[PDB]
Write a protein that binds this ligand. Structure first.
Ligand SMILES: NCCC[C@H](N)CC(=O)NCCC[C@H](N)CC(=O)NCCC[C@H](N)CC(=O)N[C@@H]1[C@H](O)[C@@H](OC(N)=O)[C@@H](CO)O[C@H]1NC1=N[C@@H]2C(=O)NC[C@@H](O)[C@H]2N1
Length: 155
RNA sequence: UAACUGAAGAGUUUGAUCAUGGCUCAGAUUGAACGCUGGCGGCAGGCUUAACACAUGCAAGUCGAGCGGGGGAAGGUAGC
């Protein structure tokens, strides 16, 4: 299980006499062969925040059906004001994406992809959109099963 | 055989936050200019502004097998 730390931020809460500071961490875990998840953690210190984020990421996982080491088809997804577009690429291309998309894709095991963000680039929302797109991407076997055809018929 | 295959973001409004939205940055390119410095070769390029005014030299001649004249050099014969 490879673990990646997308972002760490300091947040404040106002009380009488001053401010209480805390830290938030966003993490993505993945096996690298089709299983990936993400989570967030809040704590008064960075190590505890990262630990909580990793535990939440392990509790929130999905399974992704890749075509080799790339996507099955182009994907459009969005969460809130963040929109993402991902497209399969040939061998040797690599992962052409921003940091937030790159964490999720590398954790899921995608090796060749072209990706783009439109709208807001907030890390949590971008991770949400990429996660949803990867979850909703389909495969020829599922398409054939749902249509009642064969894979060769589907083409 | 081959004639293409292609898309990354970041900073900044607030005590935190998300969104909106400008401004700024990372790239490629140039008939460039300026500052510091400067060994060689190959191949290119070189008034983007005053279609402003121009000294001087050169950048369109050739034909005597179209024609009549006119020149000045070599020869020969005759006298001395
Ligand atoms: N919001 C607070 C509302 C407060 C409001 N005052 C309440 C009120 O007044 N009346 C109550 C009326 C409630 C209404 N009838 C039901 C309703 O809201 N239906 C719509 C919401 C569906 C559902 N409920 C929420 C949901 O499934 N979220 C998931 C979730 O976050 C996460 O997936 C998981 N599994 O964790 C993520 C992937 O990471 O995908 C999100 N999905 C999505 N993201 C996308 C996005 O944004 N756009 C486009 C599309 O793609 C979206 N789908």
């Amino acid at each position: 299980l490879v673990e990646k730390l997308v972002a760490v931020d300091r947040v404040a809460k106002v009380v009488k006499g001053g401010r209480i500071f805390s830290f938030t961490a966003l993490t993505v875990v993945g096996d690298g062969n089709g299983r990936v998840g993400f989570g967030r953690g809040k704590a008064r210190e960075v190590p505890a925040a990262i630990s909580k984020a990793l535990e939440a990421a392990r509790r929130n996982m999905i399974t992704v059906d890749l075509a080799g080491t790339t996507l099955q088809h182009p994907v459009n997804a969005r969460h809130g004001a963040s929109r993402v577009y991902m497209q399969p690429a040939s061998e040797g291309t690599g992962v052409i994406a921003g940091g937030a998309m790159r964490a999720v894709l590398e954790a899921a095991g995608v090796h060749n992809v072209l990706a783009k963000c439109y709208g807001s680039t907030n890390a949590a929302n971008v991770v949400n959109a990429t996660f949803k797109g990867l979850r909703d991407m389909t495969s020829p076997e599922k398409v054939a099963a749902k249509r009642g055809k064969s894979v060769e018929e589907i083409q």
